[PDB]
Design a binder for this molecule. Structure first.
Ligand code: HDE
Ligand code: HDE
Ligand SMILES: [S]
Ligand SMILES: [S]
Ligand SMILES: [S]
Lengths: 726, 726, 308, 83, 84
């Protein structure tokens, strides 16, 4: 018996705040959280406690500490089959990572629609508000490998596998509403340009290098999604606080056979929130697993990630009523023109048990649709339908990947397909072909119909010649970038300018920076000039005179494109660092901790060492982490209680903690003599917006702090930080 | 509905004789045959009746007859995911075949000991006569591919997977008691020499080619197994009628830790029986699936393959008591010296449901042992231990091949191994390493002990230098070949001479033939002279004077080495062809079928066309096959009843049927006017032993026929066949 | 879509200091640098300038910007074999990364002995001071994936493939002279303990988590290599400024058959130097490719890594 | 991809074209060709866009599909003409 | 034998290298969530060198017991006090 006698090795099977208990496999942490897919996995779940250690063949092992050898100092013998089995399985643990979105974090949950959508789609999972659909969702970055960092600047993937009663539906989306390119034929060119360069394999997790901006400079279609990536969209606070989009126009098909064009949305119920660049970049160093960790811990805490599914719906007759082509994946449909209709809610409420088995082997593909959905001719979507099935043959070892437990449908599946590597299902059908008489033709085809019918494609008219040709309707590149730019707040525009400036400064060939700047001049002059000034480049008279692109269907902004223009802040699940001293004023800490708890905001108690400190009244305060061990990058705000401030007044790490949180625009609250730290961040005596200060933590001190946290960051502090040495 | 109104598409779920019903997956044929392993496969069996046809993702298909195209004569579209999934699975159906033994046929069964063996072994499956152990057995050839023919001249494999309560034990044996070579390092040389030659990949399923005989002539250690292969051992009648052997000395270990050397045997309860060469070779053309079909149909009929497990046991102090080395796998242990102790019975009573999923993916390996067993230093076995684990990484796609349903232990298996391609088991253990405190070190090691203990190697003393050196004690090559030769009947000797003669005639390079004949002269001059004569070679004076090798520990023969020396016939499950005419004497047929039924002998009714014919008394007799459709090759005996013989008397196929049966030494019985056929086989008016004749098919006529059948073939007929042109 | 007229897209094929020129494939940067192994790769090196763009089957492509469709706003057709080859190759680019040392950076070079060692070894690559043996070296971390960061706290790998006249010799060493564990049977237990934990796959490139310290606390044999890992040896400044060791006692065998026990060492001629922890950790975010980059740039500058 | 182990099956010697082949595809299991192109994508400026597309023409031209007229609905339907 | 070579290594380092070793152990063990694991590691450190063990313990808010303070240092390695 190696476990401690007090049982402290084992986390409580109840919801607990981040950091309070060690994290655990979902079925152990939350055994009573269930859904149909989770339950269906029980046949392959393997426990451990009270079982003997064995080989894979079920032979009990006596000594798992030694190889078999001729004498205890002699050579290892080939007959040691226990050693060889154990080392063989180790030697072959790895499988190929995903070609893109290799870095990803996943969870189980469930979806329910708010009302029946039968008037517009026969999809069974949207047919009844009491119909609950298990989901498994993977969030990801795009460029980096499976061992790259979370808080890079990149697009994020948001993939949801819906285990419906009529088959798997996979909605494979991203956190921006468009993509960089128009035709799937170019996807290897684009991806190769953004990925590490082929001679030396650098940089990881970063579009900030020559080949990416070379391609962008030569392919103006990319500029729209580049604007998004350069905005703080490219650096989300959390996968809980980013939007999701299905990228393409698809169709809904109702029982009467009517088709409706649809684009899919996920709205984060926790609000939209992003980091700032210096914070995000430093945090890839201090905690490259920060988003994986934050998701897992939110779910362990009961702060379940919740998203609302929404549809933008366009009638067939309105296909051509926009300035842009609905089938062009570099174009968004502004919500001002076509509102998002709320459809239902998804809650992610349980972590996996084994990350490899459930997360790494999950296969999502946007061709996995169900009756009541269909495709369109969007030429990016069209090529995706080839890729997501092909890629699995190497990644997951063959055509039986749907038998890997996380991938299995909960709906019945029967057909005449046989064999392949790793074949699990043992088919008893006398027949492996149809038509057959020897099994009375079973399993049988099913006509389409209003419910439980066979899949039939919508009979869209095709007419034209066999051509490799881009539609002329796709040939406009600048109006959508411009609409995005004009829709951002002035601080968001600033952060876009700084993203371009930073990225282009890492481009070693200067003519590529110049060429990018020229393209920015075709979008908006103010944007082009501000980036040029940061790169020491001067616009030509001609560039100064490029006329801006047209408005989009008369729009000069759409505030839904901004992260922050319309407040949607939610503090539940956020976290505050509390900087302890060796004699804290216990009444301040009582007021702080209870105020946070009441709003679902977590805390981490930090000091210059581990263990405990004792408050003025004798309360023993447990320390979560050191100032350097849990840097301000990992929190949303910082509070310093009164007490013996001289203990930490001269601690470089403590002061720097405040400087870093200050630079990154985070709310900071200072009680009593903690106000002596005002000198560190240079705060005027009479105070400034975004610094909460009082004689004590009572009264409105916590309310004012929580008000600041609801607005996420103190954007008004931006001119002040500009000169801070931090 | 495509099935016939009368239900005749579906075979009865009851035992039925060969050809009476269409054959069927075993769980449909024999739903109520159960054992722990068959039951445990229920989680993966999939049915079909009354289910809708779907993709693998569970989406119902409406039209499984057409691809999606732009117009009904247009191009196929990339968005046809139903077509691509279906064609993708098809395109990847095949997996690598086994390197050797690729051709094989398998069945489920059970094993039960006759008494407790705890005095000599702690193997749990041998501890009690009540212990029933499920088995899956695969019989195989060695050289040919998975699509090669069954009745080739070759060694056969006989592999048994015991699903014990203490682990999988695989006993991976062959149908001869030795192997061709001494040291595993030469396995690829030997196998490359026997396999099709590398320039042109010829011949399939045959050792009758230059490279095989080249290697043999250069490596006299091969000559013992070569004698077996060249004898009628090389062409068994049926997997039910051959012996099996574990090939190596292994050890039994008992609860006190005492070691006993053991060699394993399987004794076929249907007796020993083989084809003759002409019959076997022609049978590869008429039915290359003959042994696979015969096994499957024997089990369908209730003629379950039964074998008695036998041990030759040698005390540890007796290691050096023979004039050969116990660890030399080109040496057999004569049963006259160490008798076989009969230990239990295995019964094969159910066919698989899906050949690929159960047979093709099954993985046997002789290093799969359990506590109570152990290895020895046999240098062929030692190297096998490496190969059978390594080969599955490509064949079965990775290190989780034990999760392939047929391979799973029924015993518990738990350990800290993780990941690998197509990982099924989802581990919930917080720990993936030991020693660990976080799971209280579970799953835990188990000390060795008398039952349910961990595996510990027998502490054999090793003393010697690190050398690549063959033991001098292995350096004797001719005494065992000679013992084998001297133990054969005169007709078994003639067939061995004929086997060497035929093979060597196919070797193009005549010096290779000459060198092989030189080796034969070192074994037995009579053998050497007879082969030399058929090759047009004359023994030199030196060859004529080679002193024969010594006897084996005083033995100048051992009848246990002969297939036929000691009577061992069983007619149950054999088959007789009955040659019909268009007006059969019903009284003959009634008698024939009644006597055959009483002994469990099957019959096939043959004619010149299909349909039926009508007896003298109006009994309608359904025809099973034509004379050409079901050649005498496929039966054990031929009976021709009386009736309208003029109908068939000048039918060439009918006459030839009897000539071929006659040539291949099969019992023939002729009733009434059927004796007109005596002329086509040149039988004197007064009769001949092995031809049964009478006025009618009375009681005595059938006893005589069945007596011949018990002795398998009419060996006394051999000098008559030279003259028959068939 | 072409190169600038000034030729500034193309790096000079001469040694240049870090940052002065964009970096380039070795055979284009330094085409006059050769050795027997680098030459023998010529059979498979493929250029690009002045060649037509083709499928893998050698068919020239006219339009590499578009899929074949029925009308320019129509569905993509299954007969577009150009699209499907290109996408198929892309869809199958990745192979499994190394179970351990998946993150690593490599270069070509050569080795020669200072004097013949025939008194102690008959190895041909050590027999003559003028026999040059081509090498390929890969430096690595241990725990993290191929896309993890360089300046983590970890042991480093230092693997040299010598292409000798009597066969390949791989000296597969690390930057400390011992290992954590005594018997190979425990390797999967130790590696699983240091690797990201199996429920959530955290942390990448870090032994700072419960399972690693659990294992160490239960297996005191690990303490020696742990001391090395916790020292600044765990955070080298550059692959050029760390020591290498062969980890085990091997044997040398001379022509007379005499065995001598040997342990292998590499001494960095650029000296020993390591970062400090706060700097190493921050550098994993500011430049996760710092060691890869530095090694490439030193070779391009002529600061060739040398080791004794 | 399963039979010959991945997407570099054209590098197996019997499958190799004798014609030139150059493109921006990379990696894959069993990769033989060692690409020296600074670019693995097009369009690119850093290798002056080589290897380059070739217009169709009478000889040594790029492949262009014949511009067959396509007209009808997306159907899973056998032509009556085949019946 | 598990402690003499770690001790030899420790005694061979300069005072600033020793500090960095203390800081590495302290930083790492501060990220170990289960406190008894940190305690057990500090007990192993007390078998190597008490000064090391105390300096780590202090950073982790751990106090060495009397028994731990009394652990006999492992033997020198073949007479060596250090190897630079
Ligand atoms: C709209 C959201 C979106 C878009 C436009 C694309 N990706 Fe994705 N992708 C693969 C191929 C592929 C192609 C051919 C295109 C445009 C033609 C896109 N992508 C753009 C893939 C290589 O087949 C992929 C890699 C592994 C895999 O199974 O599929 C793939 C990944 C991917 C993910 C990750 C899903 C997951 O496994 O967690 C997501 C969210 C996207 N793509 C979104 C996406
Ligand atoms: C004596 C019974 C016996 C003997 C002595 C050998 N084979 Fe077999 N064989 C494999 C390799 C192998 C080696 C290395 C040696 C001597 C060193 C033998 N054989 C002699 C193998 C390549 O690992 C093999 C190929 C597929 C596989 O899984 O293992 C293999 C097959 C095999 C079978 C087939 C079992 C089955 O799949 O049905 C049998 C019955 C034998 N060997 C018997 C055997
Ligand atoms: S998209
Ligand atoms: S054997
Ligand atoms: S080592």
């Amino acid at each position: 018996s190696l476990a401690p006698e007090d049982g402290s090795h084992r986390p409580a099977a109840e919801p607990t705040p981040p950091g309070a208990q060690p994290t655990a496999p979902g079925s152990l942490k939350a055994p009573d959280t269930r859904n149909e897919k989770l339950n269906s996995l029980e046949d392959v779940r393997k426990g451990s406690e009270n079982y003997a250690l064995t080989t894979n063949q079920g032979v009990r092992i006596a000594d798992d500490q030694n190889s078999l050898r001729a004498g205890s100092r002699g050579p290892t013998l080939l007959e040691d089959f226990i050693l060889r089995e154990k080392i063989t399985h180790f030697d072959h643990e790895r499988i190929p990572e995903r070609i893109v979105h290799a870095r990803g974090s996943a969870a189980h949950g469930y979806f329910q629609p708010y009302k029946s959508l039968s008037d517009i789609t026969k999809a069974d999972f949207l047919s009844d508000p009491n119909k609950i659909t298990p989901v498994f969702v993977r969030f990801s970055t795009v460029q980096g490998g499976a061992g790259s960092a979370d808080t890079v600047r990149d697009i994020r993937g948001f993939a949801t596998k819906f285990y419906t009663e009529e088959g798997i539906f996979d909605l494979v989306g991203n956190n921006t509403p468009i993509f960089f390119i128009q035709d799937a034929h170019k996807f290897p060119d684009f991806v190769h340009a953004v990925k590490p360069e082929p001679h030396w394999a650098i940089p990881q997790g970063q579009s900030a290098h020559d080949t990416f901006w070379d391609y962008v400079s030569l392919q103006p279609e990319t500029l729209h999604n580049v604007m998004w990536a350069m905005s703080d969209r490219g650096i989300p606070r959390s996968y809980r606080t980013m939007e999701g989009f299905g990228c393409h126009t698809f169709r809904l098909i109702n029982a009467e056979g009517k088709a409706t064009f649809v684009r899919f949305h996920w709205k984060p119920l926790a609000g939209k929130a992003s980091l700032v660049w210096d914070e995000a970049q430093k945090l890839t160093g201090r905690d490259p697993d920060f988003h994986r960790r934050e998701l897992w811990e939110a779910i362990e805490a009961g702060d379940f990630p919740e998203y609302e599914l929404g549809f933008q719906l366009i009638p067939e007759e309105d296909e051509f009523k926009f300035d842009f082509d609905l089938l062009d994946p570099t174009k968004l449909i502004p919500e001002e023109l076509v509102p998002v209709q709320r459809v239902g809610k998804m809650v992610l409420n349980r972590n996996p048990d084994n990350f490899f088995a459930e997360n790494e082997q999950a296969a999502f593909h946007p061709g996995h649709i169900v009756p009541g959905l269909d495709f369109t001719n969007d030429p990016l979507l069209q090529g995706r339908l080839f890729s997501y099935t092909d890629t699995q043959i190497s990644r997951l070892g063959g055509p039986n990947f749907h038998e890997i437990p996380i991938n299995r449908p909960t709906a019945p599946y029967h057909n005449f397909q046989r064999d392949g590597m790793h074949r699990m299902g043992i088919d008893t059908n006398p027949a492996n072909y149809e038509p057959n008489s020897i099994n009375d033709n079973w399993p049988r085809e099913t006509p389409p119909g209003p419910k439980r019918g066979g899949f039939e494609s919508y009979q869209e008219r095709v007419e034209g010649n066999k051509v490799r040709e881009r539609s002329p309707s796709f040939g406009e590149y600048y109006s959508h970038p411009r609409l995005f730019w004009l829709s951002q707040t002035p601080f968001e525009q600033r952060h876009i300018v700084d993203g371009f400036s930073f990225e282009l400064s890492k481009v070693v060939r200067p003519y590529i920076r110049e060429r990018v700047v020229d393209q920015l001049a075709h979008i908006d002059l103010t944007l082009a000039q501000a980036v040029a000034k940061n790169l020491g480049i001067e616009l030509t008279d001609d560039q100064l005179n490029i006329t801006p692109p047209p408005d989009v269907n008369g729009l000069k902004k759409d505030p839904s494109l901004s992260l922050y223009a319309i407040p949607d802040g939610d503090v539940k699940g956020r976290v505050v660092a509390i900087l302890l001293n060796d004699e804290v004023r216990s009444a301040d800490l009582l007021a702080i901790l209870k105020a946070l708890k009441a709003k679902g905001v977590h805390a981490k108690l930090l000091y210059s060492r581990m263990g405990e400190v004792t408050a003025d009244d004798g309360t023993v305060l447990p320390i979560a982490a050191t100032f350097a061990g849990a840097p301000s990058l990992t929190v949303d705000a910082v509070i310093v209680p009164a007490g013996n401030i001289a203990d930490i007044a001269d601690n470089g790490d403590a002061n720097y903690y405040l400087m870093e949180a200050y630079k990154h625009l985070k709310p900071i609250a200072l009680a009593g003599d903690a106000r002596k730290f005002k000198a560190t961040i240079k705060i005027a005596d009479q105070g400034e917006e975004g610094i909460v200060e009082a004689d004590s933590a009572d009264g409105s001190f916590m309310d004012e702090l929580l008000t600041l946290m609801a607005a996420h960051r103190v954007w008004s502090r931006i001119p002040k930080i500009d000169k801070i040495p931090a």
